[PDB]
Design a protein around this ligand. Structure first.
Ligand SMILES: O=C(N/N=C/c1cc(Br)c(O)c(Br)c1O)c1ccc(Br)cc1
Ligand SMILES: O=C(N/N=C/c1cc(Br)c(O)c(Br)c1O)c1ccc(Br)cc1
Ligand SMILES: [Cl-]
Ligand SMILES: [Cl-]
Ligand SMILES: [Cl-]
Ligand SMILES: [Cl-]
Ligand SMILES: [Cl-]
Ligand SMILES: [Cl-]
Lengths: 152, 150, 148, 152, 151, 152
């Protein structure tokens, strides 16, 4: 299992697609422990047409979504390694989200870095927590519990 | 205390594709609000969440609850005032106790039920659930702060 | 009932031209009742019209045609995704359509279509579109199922 | 009143906008009588993503919409002439549609020419009828009645 | 053949919405020249931002269309209309030169691409020509691409 | 005239809007001499739906467009400084493009950096040339001449 993955790999693991695949690259990955990934934020994203006009702010809820996707990748690969065939049969679902705090607004030009760590894991149930960072500063923090379920 | 999309457009700064509230069916100042957003396949989000399996994003359910709550907080203090609405912004500070129980899909009428847990000055804490056909599909607590635009 | 997943297996239409979200009633060679939710979160509203969201009358008719199309597919071969994935549908005629009430975000656009006449791949249906029990539009149309 | 109008002029008269402004140019226009205009059809249009996958067919209902918009432009300029200030607060409602027949499918690379004639008009209520053509051939026939109304 | 419609173009070029900028091919002569075109309608997303109240088809996209026309010519020159083989190839465009824009392109225009092979050595194809609207040269450019095995 | 401009400033100067505003932030600016800016590349961009499926690659022509917009931002501010009022009355026209080379493909997660210098400028006509860089490496080269014109 490698520690760096690019968009082509992320595409083979996550079921998410435009306009909901919110992770561009993974820089650090340690099975059952943590992951560090990021998503570039550009004005050239449909979301900014409505959030907000003349005032582009990346939706906080999407920051959270990005962290979860990161956690989901971590969870899956921790269990099956880089296995596209199986990834294609599994799907990660949000069970809970807690202690979410937005400290700094994210805007075009920003590199939204996700820092998630495994707080608890047993089988398909994974609890992760971490922060979203921009230039080393915590722009947000959150905790979530995910479920690795069947796609059917 | 019915508001339709046109009224909503004059209060919330959110526009497509991030205005997630279609109508407000109930509103009690400083107490509660009930609103909803219809879920149809004809939404761009479904192209990627997920292909061959449309599921309205859980985070977007929370966003819709937030928008409803912000609408509740705003109108409670200033009522239906478009002019003042442009000079104020309601952004969220925290979100907690979020739980997803049932997946929302095209055909569902996503109803938001938020009540004021407490408020002090420009800091308001709302909480409640998201419902479809009378069942709780999600629940969450959010804290917002009303500030001057600019 | 047939949900979006089932509708996707029969109708060839896709985003942003799949305008039926669910099938509530189906009676082979007789009628069909289905609907589509109308939400502000639809790209059409950016241009119809700015500052005044009104669901296009022609799209209401399209939604009725699709509903009729689903009735035609199933009446012809039942719920068969395999043969369905090879056909498409062409509009042939549209007649006697009247719009009485504008459809907007928050509305539940319900399609009520019955078979007027049909032969082979050519189906002619007619009915109304309703929002909360009231008729918002009436129409008759004939479409043809074809091998793509 | 001119007889040739370009997209810029159309934008100043019709309230429609992307993705529902289906008229690119007006080639000839006779007040209270007829109008000839057209819309280019290209693969680079969002509708084609779903109508249909691997087989781009310009939706029949949108052809009708295009003719209605052509009629709408004719209706407005016949009423107030070319006046953008009056135009910016008017919208247009479809009232009825009749005797439409589609003969030939329209596809990317086609120049959809609208030919509408005024059958009857009274105040804001205009009833036009005509055809849509491609390379001199009739691909559609349609009769419609639309109402111009002040936004309120 | 000499005339390919959108159906055929789709089976040869990997490009898809919103980057497939060639609607039909009216002329094709293996190893020599290609004449094709793309209609320009207001109903295109690019016009939402280029520019508000002033729809001007982007000059770089005219070049892209020409490039796509060159790529179809090159490919068809090597294997003809072969969808199966098309799936295993890619045409990397290495350079662009001598491009000049003479007349803006707008909704309602039939952008016609006129390209010819200027040189072909190995996997390298140098193409050049013009973009026309109603008989008038609207733009011109030279492009060089490399044929390679897709991956 | 400062040297760092964020998206809010770019929005008030350049007439480009979604989905054609391909410059997110200005990092260095020397009036009439040079500019360094960038655009973040994310998978969450509509253009990637078609360029190409299962293989996101930021279009070479769009990189040139990005360099042109950076040039346009330099040209305008050199001429009128930060003046939103006057910026509203202009648009930018591409006149020529030359010597462009595409050395390295640009993909999601990349920070596309634009480096442009003024080769010549006379009135509204500006000739700029430079490179596009990702992590200090030259990804593309180009020379172009644009013109700032009245919206009329
Ligand atoms: O500024 C924020 N949100 N929205 C701000 C905003 C919206 C509009 Br519309 C506007 O015109 C302006 Br002036 C704003 O600051 C924000 C600021 C800080 C954090 Br923490 C989260 C959100
Ligand atoms: O980087 C690429 N550039 N161009 C590919 C391409 C393929 C064909 Br056949 C063609 O005619 C052209 Br014009 C192309 O640009 C490329 C690489 C991978 C994939 Br999938 C598709 C395209
Ligand atoms: Cl936010
Ligand atoms: Cl979800
Ligand atoms: Cl209508
Ligand atoms: Cl059709
Ligand atoms: Cl240009
Ligand atoms: Cl490219």
């Amino acid at each position: 299992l490698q520690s760096q993955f690019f968009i082509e790999h992320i595409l083979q693991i996550l079921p998410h697609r435009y306009p909901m695949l919110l992770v561009d690259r993974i820089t650090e990955l340690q099975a059952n422990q943590k992951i560090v990934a990021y998503k570039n934020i550009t004005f050239n994203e449909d979301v900014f047409n409505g959030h907000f006009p003349n005032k582009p702010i990346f939706p906080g809820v999407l920051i959270v979504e990005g962290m979860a996707q990161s956690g989901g990748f971590l969870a899956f690969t921790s269990l099956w390694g880089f296995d596209p065939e199986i990834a294609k049969t599994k799907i990660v679902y949000f069970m809970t989200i807690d202690k979410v705090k937005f400290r700094i607004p994210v805007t075009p030009g920003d590199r939204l870095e996700y820092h998630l760590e495994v707080l608890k894991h047993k089988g398909m149930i994974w609890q992760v927590g971490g922060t979203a960072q921009v230039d080393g500063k915590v722009v947000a923090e959150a905790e979530l519990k995910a479920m690795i379920a069947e796609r059917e």
